[PDB]
Design a binder for this molecule. Structure first.
Ligand SMILES: Nc1ncnc2c1ncn2[C@@H]1O[C@H](COP(=O)(O)OP(=O)(O)O)[C@@H](O)[C@H]1O
Ligand SMILES: Nc1ncnc2c1ncn2[C@@H]1O[C@H](COP(=O)(O)OP(=O)(O)O)[C@@H](O)[C@H]1O
Ligand SMILES: Nc1ncnc2c1ncn2[C@@H]1O[C@H](COP(=O)(O)OP(=O)(O)O)[C@@H](O)[C@H]1O
Ligand SMILES: [Cl-]
Ligand SMILES: [Cl-]
Ligand SMILES: [Cl-]
Ligand SMILES: [Mg+2]
Ligand SMILES: [Mg+2]
Ligand SMILES: [Mg+2]
Lengths: 308, 308, 308
């Protein structure tokens, strides 16, 4: 099966025990909101919701998230199948921790570095194959495209103009620099550089990072001549404040039941949505009562993926 | 003299002894087709043709081809004279073997690697000159331009748009990457990379390589301030199936007796045709009877160069 | 104070003692032309002029010029303030010697190499700051833009098209290559490369270098997140032969009392003129009588800066 939707709950000392309930199947989650105090509201409002997804992860290690959501998609990529892993959820819920993780201790590193590590590990198990790895790192902010690995990465589209294009092989970004990474250390160094660059560019350009989408792309070529891309995506916060998410959610509604070019995000991800791609959605949610309404919104989104 | 036309015959256990005859002068070749069996045809059809070119090479070593067709043109380049060496002929006749040669034993390497070797050797004989070498590698396929040394060389013009341009110094390719090669090993590595890339791109883009033109360019700068280019060209098979050859043949007809921009090939080679260039044509022909008609077509083309 | 104007007199065995007089204040210079021999002219013509600038340097060492005109502006740059140092004056007066200096002995090196040296020295005094240095090198000639560090730097705008652009951060040059310099040796090597390239490009493109403007840009990023540029400018000779200077002089007249886009120079330097920049003008003048008229023209220009 090509599309998966998971939920990762953020750990908390103050878990909403009464309001958040995990199914025995480890795939279900039920939300029980507190009844409204207003007499007109309390007897007209739905307070209970049930959701069945591909997996629900709470108090899950980084190692376990990777094994569960990511490992297979990265495996299929060396065989020529495009894979996208996307983190979605409100600001603070755990998207960047899930995708990047701790930048200063191995055990707590996230999906993206483990993906790079797995690619190069896998290349060792295929000694008769000439496997070549390339990377790019793109930020989308307010309908503008930024190259996190460009030669002057703290200045905008005026200097480094980029345009999403399409060909028989998929969707690429004209102007977005593509870097050959011979070994995992080359790929790790570039991930570090682009992350440093992202931070500098947010300060330099007065961007709110909660509103940006970041897409790290691994381009694979192995020769049987095969090519693929793995897209590792940290989305803008879903609390819609960030318009482009609405086109992404609209797209996913359409696929379940599309103007891809209407939005940079949906255009960049066209090949990840319509058909020829292993899509994994990781839905980051708070475990606390005060965020339950945004949590339900995220879970309703997560729940659209089974119909795609 | 600025224009030379040679013929190289491909070696064969089944040579067409009755039908292919080499002149004593080592410059002539005569073709004697078999008479048609049809009564209306046999007494109205020309079966004998004679051709005089600058040299006819049969059962010739790689070392001898280089010394004969290429060596002088590469010499003149360090002195500031542009040089083009072009292989022409039907698919299977020996264009790629003549231009690239054996990629896995020194003795049988072709023109292109020997040219790179000669350039850097010559730089050693000129110790008071600061000589700088740069390279590019371009494939032309079906009126599209591809950079064999680009950062993502298995995707097309959509990502890496290129445009042939002209200035007081000649014709160049905007968007085509140009690589400084400090030593012969840097140039050899890039030739290897672009060749690997060509193969991957043919599989990835479903190109038939018999239909593509490939142009390796050596840009020389030596300081008396001098610049030159050496263009080493492996043309599309001449069996016209490949349209662009017809504009090249038309061009050469015109020069002997021009809309350069009508065709990418003729535009890219504008400076190699009209005037200020040492042009060497190497015409690759089969030695076998079954290919004699295409052989004659190639020799008629080869024979247009003496009038240029 | 943001704008400074200095004068550097070129040393001479034949100094114009009667006609050139230095004020005690080391900031003033007076010019006394020789009376015209024509009866109608001599009693209607001004022969005496006085000028007060920020400093007048005669028989000044390279070390002293740097300390006086440049040192502070380079200091302010690490703190986030943009700085431009510009050499102006007639061909032969000392612009290139002041800005580049002797390329073959340390003591006599000019402003530009000392600036690069000071930047990297200063980075050592700031061990808790991550400071990143980038460079570009641009020649402006006859309204065309050239990249002195491009991949084929002896061919023009046809291959390497560049466009001056503007954003909330200032004015940059789309298409102009930007090079990360990790250490002073990387920056020194690129300065050497671009200078070699400039010379080759002047011969190759038949440029008169007295008519070109050259702008070496140091891009600084330090993290408090700060960015700046230092622009080190060697202008075209002011003997106007070179049109673009007239728009620069017009601009400076306007600021003292603007169509920046009318001229590549003024557009490239927009951020150096209107407001947010530490501008230092170094006015190179001959010490000899035969050049006194061009000297006065330069000093009248130098004198416009105090009103900016
Ligand atoms: N599973 C988790 N375990 C421990 N800490 C987490 C986890 N998920 C998120 N956090 C922490 O919560 C904070 C917010 O997480 P982050 O990934 O930055 O949210 P988002 O990217 O969705 O805005 C971070 O300081 C991070 O350390
Ligand atoms: N002079 C030669 N000596 C030995 N083998 C040759 C020679 N010319 C061509 N060949 C062989 O013939 C085949 C076709 O040659 P190739 O150069 O690929 O043709 P083209 O490029 O014109 O299609 C190759 O396998 C090559 O090894
Ligand atoms: N202060 C100085 N001390 C010694 N020589 C100088 C000085 N200024 C200029 N020169 C010399 O004068 C010549 C012209 O100077 P240059 O800097 O090339 O002029 P410009 O760049 O203004 O045309 C050079 O040969 C240079 O060595
Ligand atoms: Cl963990
Ligand atoms: Cl041989
Ligand atoms: Cl000095
Ligand atoms: Mg985040
Ligand atoms: Mg071939
Ligand atoms: Mg000069």
């Amino acid at each position: 099966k090509k599309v998966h939707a998971f939920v990762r709950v953020k750990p908390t000392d103050d878990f909403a025990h009464e309001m958040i309930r995990y199914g025995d199947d480890k795939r279900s989650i039920d939300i029980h909101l507190k009844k409204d105090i207003r007499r007109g509201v309390v007897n007209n409002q739905q307070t209970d919701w049930s959701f069945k997804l591909d997996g629900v992860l709470h108090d899950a290690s980084q190692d376990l998230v990777y094994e569960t959501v990511a490992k297979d998609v990265v495996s299929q990529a060396l065989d020529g199948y495009n894979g996208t892993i996307m983190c979605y959820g409100q600001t603070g819920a755990g998207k960047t921790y899930t995708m990047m993780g701790a930048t200063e201790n191995y055990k707590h590193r996230g999906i993206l570095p483990r993906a790079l590590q797995q690619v190069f590990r896998m290349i060792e198990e295929r000694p008769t194959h000439a496997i070549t790895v390339r990377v790019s790192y793109l930020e989308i902010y307010n309908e503008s495209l930024f190259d996190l690995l460009s030669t002057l990465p703290y200045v905008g589209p005026s200097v480094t103009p980029m345009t999403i294009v399409e060909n028989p092989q998929g969707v690429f970004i004209k102007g977005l620099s593509v870097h050959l990474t011979s070994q995992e250390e080359d790929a790790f160094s570039l991930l570090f550089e682009g992350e440093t660059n992202r931070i500098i560019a947010s300060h330099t350009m007065n961007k709110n990072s909660s509103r940006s989408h970041c897409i790290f792309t691994i381009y694979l070529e192995a020769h049987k001549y095969i090519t693929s891309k793995i897209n590792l995506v940290d989305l803008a916060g879903s609390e819609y404040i960030n318009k482009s998410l609405s086109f992404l959610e609209q797209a996913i509604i359409a696929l379940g039941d599309i103007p891809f070019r209407q939005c940079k995000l949906t255009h960049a991800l066209k090949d990840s949505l319509g058909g020829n791609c292993n899509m994994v959605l990781v839905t980051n949610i708070y475990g606390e009562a005060a965020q339950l309404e945004e949590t339900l919104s995220s879970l309703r989104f997560a729940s659209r993926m089974k119909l795609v």
